[PDB]
Amino acid sequence: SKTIRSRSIWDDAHAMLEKAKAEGISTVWDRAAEQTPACKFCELGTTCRNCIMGPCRIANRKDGKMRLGVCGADADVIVARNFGRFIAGGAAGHSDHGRDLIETLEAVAEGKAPGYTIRDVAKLRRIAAELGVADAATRPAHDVAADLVTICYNDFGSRRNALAFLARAPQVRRDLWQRLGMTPRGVDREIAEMMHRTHMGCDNDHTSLLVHAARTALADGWGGSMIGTELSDILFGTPRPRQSTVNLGVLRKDAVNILVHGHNPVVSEMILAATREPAVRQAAQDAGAADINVAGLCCTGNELLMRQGIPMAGNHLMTELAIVTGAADAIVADYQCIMPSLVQIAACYHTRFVTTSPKGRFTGATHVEVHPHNAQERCREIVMLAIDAYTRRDPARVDIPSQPVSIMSGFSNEAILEALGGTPKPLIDAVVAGQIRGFVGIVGCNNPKIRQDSANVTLTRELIRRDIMVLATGCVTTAAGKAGLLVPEAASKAGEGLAAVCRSLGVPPVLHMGSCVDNSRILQLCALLATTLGVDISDLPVGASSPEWYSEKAAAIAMYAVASGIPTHLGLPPNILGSENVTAMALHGLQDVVGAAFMVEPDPVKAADMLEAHIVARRARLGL
Amino acid sequence: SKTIRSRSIWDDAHAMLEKAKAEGISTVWDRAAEQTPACKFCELGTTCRNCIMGPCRIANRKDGKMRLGVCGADADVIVARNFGRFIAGGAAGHSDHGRDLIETLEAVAEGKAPGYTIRDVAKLRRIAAELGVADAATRPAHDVAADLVTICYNDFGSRRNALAFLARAPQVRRDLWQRLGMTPRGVDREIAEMMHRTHMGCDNDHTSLLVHAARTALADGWGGSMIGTELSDILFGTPRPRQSTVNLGVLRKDAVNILVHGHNPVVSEMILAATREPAVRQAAQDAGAADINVAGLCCTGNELLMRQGIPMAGNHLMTELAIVTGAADAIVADYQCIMPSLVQIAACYHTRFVTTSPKGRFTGATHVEVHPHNAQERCREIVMLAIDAYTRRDPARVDIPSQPVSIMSGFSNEAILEALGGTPKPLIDAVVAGQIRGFVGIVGCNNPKIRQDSANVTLTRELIRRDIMVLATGCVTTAAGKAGLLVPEAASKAGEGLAAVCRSLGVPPVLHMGSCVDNSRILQLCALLATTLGVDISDLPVGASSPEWYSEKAAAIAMYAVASGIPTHLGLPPNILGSENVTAMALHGLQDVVGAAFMVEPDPVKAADMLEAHIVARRARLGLT
Ligand code: SF4
Ligand code: SF4
Ligand code: FES
Ligand SMILES: [Cl-]
Ligand SMILES: [Cl-]
Ligand SMILES: [Cl-]
Ligand SMILES: [Mg+2]
Ligand SMILES: [Mg+2]
Ligand SMILES: [Mg+2]
Ligand SMILES: [Mg+2]
Known about the structure:
The structure is a homodimer.
Chain A: H1 2-7, H2 11-22, H3 28-34, H4 40-44, E1 47-48, E2 56-57, H5 75-109, H6 121-130, H7 141-155, H8 171-180, H9 187-197, H10 206-236, E3 242-246, E4 256-261, H11 265-275, H12 278-286, E5 292-297, H13 298-308, E6 312-314, H14 319-324, E7 330-333, H15 341-347, E8 352-355, E9 366-367, H16 375-390, E10 405-409, H17 413-419, H18 425-433, E11 438-442, H19 454-465, E12 468-473, H20 476-482, H21 496-505, E13 510-514, H22 519-533, E14 542-546, H23 552-563, E15 568-570, H24 580-589, H25 591-594, E16 598-600, H26 604-621
Parallel strand pairs in A: 4-5, 4-7, 5-6, 7-8, 8-9, 11-12, 11-14, 12-13, 14-15, 15-16
Antiparallel strand pairs in A: 1-2, 3-10
Bound molecules: iron/sulfur cluster (2 copies), FE2/S2 (inorganic) cluster (FES), chloride ion (3 copies) and magnesium ion (4 copies).
Binding site for Fe(3+) (chain A): 516
Protein name (chain A): Carbon monoxide dehydrogenase
Organism (chain A): Nitratidesulfovibrio vulgaris (strain ATCC 29579 / DSM 644 / CCUG 34227 / NCIMB 8303 / VKM B-1760 / Hildenborough) (Desulfovibrio vulgaris)
């Protein structure tokens, strides 16, 4: 089918799209077509629904009418407020994620989280000492954890002048933030202040609104997400390199297939542990299965991949198709990016759709709520539901379409530094020598507006060919993985300089650095490289790119990348083009404020040219 | 003009609308007409922009298309998420306001706020003791203040199971909230969680979303707003009854007129103090003025009215018209409900438009930022800017249209209890005897969709005629004031029972209880009455109404009133009618969950009937006639 061919580059997606059509199942692509064309005001950002003096629409008319909202706000204010709330929603997703990790580490410290423990005590003592816990090296681990919990919770309070992890950024960058009024102070506080500023008659200056949008996003990258990443490593282990597989072929016809979907490893790690219990495995055998097969979707899949090597079934636009295989015995979801259509598609089969979070409620789902105190018992209950669902699987509707593709995951900063011998000097030397011209983090989503993973894969191939190492996170992981680029042998696809470094280290030219919260690792790596060189992050040969983004979370990541000094490419524009001034600020003006700006370019080859050009200019700023 | 008559019931508004039209000045009414008809999907709530898989619209088409967003979300989810973010924006406005008061009290306790003091130490010690500060009755005031600051900041953290002031609610109500998952835990936390829940692929159950909307609003009424009110009383004094005046006639042709606008008294109290410095008064006289004349707009005006008796120039839809008088020499703004049109209208005159908050930035304004450590110095600079602007006032463009109307303000709960002799017993006795059949808080805004204050005033008149005492806050204050209902003599307009009680106490039938954050005073009063009677707030003969609301803050107030058990009337619907299920939950389903629901009724006489009928039903359950 020509329609099916245009929706994805992958054979496993094509096969399930044909199967979905044959069974009359509507997918995200079908609903995207129904919503095209979109409302032009909504797409431009020139619409406001923030009070019931409105709603209002703005147009650039010669007769002067509809130039202002009822309150008098112009297009610049309305667009900037909409963008600010958009970013705030993204930051809030990461904020609540990080908060849940704090609450879990606290439950461990109190001895009230059966089945949870401190799995990297060394990192616990290191992070606690870094953030100022007294005698972190020698005090009992639970006491050190309790003090770290208090520091993290205080960053979710209203009394700080700067977030705890912000001290990682170079001094020149913290000084710049302080002067600009951009320093993030509290993870929840910046979000709440954004919602206040965007109320009618509060912040009515587009520049001020965008500066606080930067501050809100920085409170994510250096706050909610960084706390999420570092505490997840403490609770579940610091990732180290390991082999795994990717695509729908990780599902097994002869096993109980449990797909974990969503974001928080507090749930998926305990689902995994439940499947490994002897009596639970025995119950699956008694049902006729060969074993229990856990496979990951989206970010929680990234987390199990990074720490346990659990194979990943797919990314955002693969989620509906994973159920269409007919082999998904249960989906276990927590929150964020879980399309509610999955509840209806699961209803077409035997599949149990299980929700686990009080925040991720889906009408018609099977709710088995999970908290640290009951997770071990509840996750065992959930696996038994999956085994019971497996006994009702219709074999005539099963179609697992592909063979899995080998990948290498686990590239935490700890893992990168260990592969380098313990210091960043061999990496710095390769950059100075020009073997590695720079680094680009390719992050973010899929979007039905772009043929699935076409731009993600093309940009990855273009960059490594130009001796630019790629750091992959989020749903881009599945793209690079299915393209064969997450293995050391993919050095054959890189330019001469990058291939030589990769082969000397035994690593791929594309390093999987984790989930979307683990974009905080890229911030940490840039801060480390800048501090070692005595420069700003805005002087490093780095870039960021989300060629196929969709979510508010992705926009917040892009904003905190830009605000931290990292030129950031987006394949698609945010809904801001109705304000020329807001657009010019995002694409150009921010360069003169924070030392980086957004780029919007749907051609991934042209995006590669633009990212490379910034890297070249940065290499000149360093006199290379 | 028939068009001008239809926009407001007030002569001062009519006069300035005529003047604005003659000078070619566009007002909020003119822009409301340009924006009518509105977008159908935006009006119904059936549109979503929460990701760039969209934007999406939900339609009812024969081919069945556009029933779902690209992610699969239906109309119920989209409408509920939109209403949830709407509520979170209102809660956030009050939240940041309360936070600023915490930071001000902390600066005072540290001795780093020249010109600020603890004006009500007795209330400081009482509130601190109520919230658990050890030895609040005896320790040094600055130590007690530091400990109270810590308790208030902890409610803006992420470690509480319940907000500190929630203990005021009766146990039965706290038990209900706890079972429902509605207990507010952290003022910022609930707002952040709402923004998370409304991200694509998180909370996709409309009942769940509305329950968290209730929790988010409760974190305002029992958190951000109540902290704001109580700390404002501690810093600037507990309101007591006093006389003042209202309407555009409070401006003086012979004076430097400084209009304070916005919400935070931390600024307007220090502007007022600066105008009272002898050297600053002398500068105004040397410029030709008789004096400096501070007048209030919107909530910061309510604040200065309640605590200093400062006359109030007008409410929401009067704000542009106050500049059209040609006598506004400076507008001093902080944040919230400040229409950016005021910047352009000021530019048509000599008026200086001064912003004072890092949060309230206006392109083209004169920014003179104010913080506790520099407010005394900066507010003096702002008043000197106003005196300079006065020297450039064009006398030929001045038209102050009316004579001011006398009002009585200052009815804090402390003042009400003092008028009752120290206890609520005489008020309960009047309620039991049926002299006062019930109480209704009339709160909230103006809205160009309704002839200004027509519904505010008609509802107030209808209720007091039916022996229902009215508690007025926000922009309703100005409406009742200009109607002549905020004075003791207005008992003549109430029914026989309410008139007798009012005359025995010497109070008006309409009690001004302050600004929009001071709607927390109404929550405190209901909680006190419920606890004294041993019932829930949902058992009290009470109601709430915003006949002419517009803001997200007003919806958050309505939501936390409903969630606390207060039947709440809105003159206009929120943008939710695109979902019958969400609408039915708001208007009916909540009744069975929290003991109260929303009502939507644009006819203020019918609104009076519905509010009274709820009051009659609650009086029956108390065993009264
Ligand atoms: S805030 Fe202003 S632009 Fe937005 S809906 Fe209200 S009146 Fe219209
Ligand atoms: S969240 Fe769902 S309904 Fe909203 S814009 Fe995105 S795809 Fe459309
Ligand atoms: S749907 Fe109302 S403006 Fe786009
Ligand atoms: Cl035109
Ligand atoms: Cl508590
Ligand atoms: Cl009722
Ligand atoms: Mg706990
Ligand atoms: Mg500033
Ligand atoms: Mg301070
Ligand atoms: Mg619950």
